[PDB]
Amino acid sequence: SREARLIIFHAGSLSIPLSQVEEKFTKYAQEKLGVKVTFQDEASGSVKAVRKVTDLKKRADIVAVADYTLIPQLMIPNYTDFYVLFATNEIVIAFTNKSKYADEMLKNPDKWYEILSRPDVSFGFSDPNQDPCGYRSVMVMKLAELYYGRPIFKELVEKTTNIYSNGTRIYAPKEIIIKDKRVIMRPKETDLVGLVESGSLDYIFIYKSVAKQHHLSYITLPDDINLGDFNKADFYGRVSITLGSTGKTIKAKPIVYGITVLKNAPNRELAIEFLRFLLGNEGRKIFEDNYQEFLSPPVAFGNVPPEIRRLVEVK
């Protein structure tokens, strides 16, 4: 095959570094594999990306998600038999100098929930049923309620939408309704960036890597609630969310991205070469430069391709 195409369904937060890795792989594929490669890339919230394969039965070679959990939970063994954990992230609150009370937010980051509770302030997060950034945002507000001892989840989520909780279990209905129009929602977190940049939306919950990639202002949240501290897994794990889209429950946990090549990938050998290139030195460098460093090393589970065995730790 001289000319080949790779179809990748992936998390929206991976868009920027993935696009750069794809560019470099195209050159590499020609020079080392003698193949002219083109990508049929489809960015969406990770839950939707997985469902496109498992429920809508669409064709794809590679699926890369922002929450590795989704792969063993929904794709194994029918669609794939392995997955690789390869990068991490944390949730931050992003904005720009045009956002209302931006200076105050920067100066008093610990009072972030008081500013978001103001009626004249608009904030957004992605759809929990489609995007891990969105279900993580809701979980972060629940952890915030538990951590600070203030009614943050009741104020920011239950008052503004029909997403609800009982104890530490959160429920995202199939049909989400926004009651307070100062709250904006979009299918994936990266859709929120344009809204903040234009100044029409004041604050957004989003990954630190995405905020830095788009040069947005942001404040960090406590490690006990931001999902970036691996030592807080037991505390994070007390909170969970049940998605209307899949009917399944996902626990809040340290953020770890996952990737896999499908059993019926149309260009499976080429897809595996791409995975080897991505987890290799060139991919690692590109992700580091986009503020999302790889795990050292990435960890792989299941029937791992021998081609990437020197690049991952098998479990």
- Integer Cα distance of 239 and 256 in angstroms: 17
Q: Which residues of 92-106 are buried (b: 16+ CB within 10 A; e: fewer)?
A: bbbbbeebbbbeebe
How far is residue 115 from each of residues 1, 152, 166, measured CA to CA in Å? 57, 11, 25
Residue 189 annotated as binding?
Answer: yes
The SS3 of residue 235 is helix
Residue 240 annotated as binding?
Answer: no
- What are the two backbone dihedrals, phi and then psi, of residue 262, each rounded to the nearest 5 degrees? -70, 150
Strand-by-strand arrangement of the 240-243 sheet: 164-166, 169-172, 240-243, 249-251
DSSP assignment of 248-266 equals -EEE----EEEEEE-TT-T
Residue 222 annotated as binding?
Answer: no
How far is residue 235 from each of residues 68, 164, 269, 295, measured CA to CA in Å? 19, 20, 41, 22
Structure tokens at 176: 């989400």
Residue with tokens 């979009």: 186
Residue with tokens 């989003």: 206
Residue 131 annotated as binding?
Answer: yes
Strand 203-207 versus strand 183-186 pairing type: unpaired
Query: What is the 8-class DSSP label of residue 293?
Result: P
Domains annotated for the chain, with CATH where assigned, are 1-88+256-315 (3.40.190.10), 89-255 (3.40.190.10)
Beta strands in the chain (DSSP E): 3-11, 36-44, 62-65, 82-88, 91-95, 123-126, 164-166, 169-172, 183-186, 203-207, 217-220, 240-243, 249-251, 256-261, 294-302, 313-314
Whether 241 and 135 have beta carbons less than 8 Å apart is answered as: yes
Experimental technique behind these coordinates:
X-ray
Residue 132 annotated as binding?
Answer: yes
Residue 236 annotated as binding?
Answer: no
Residue 12 annotated as binding?
Answer: yes
- Integer Cα distance of 162 and 175 in angstroms: 9
Q: Which candidate, 133, 106, 111, places its Cα nearest to that of 210?
A: 133
Residue 46 annotated as binding?
Answer: yes
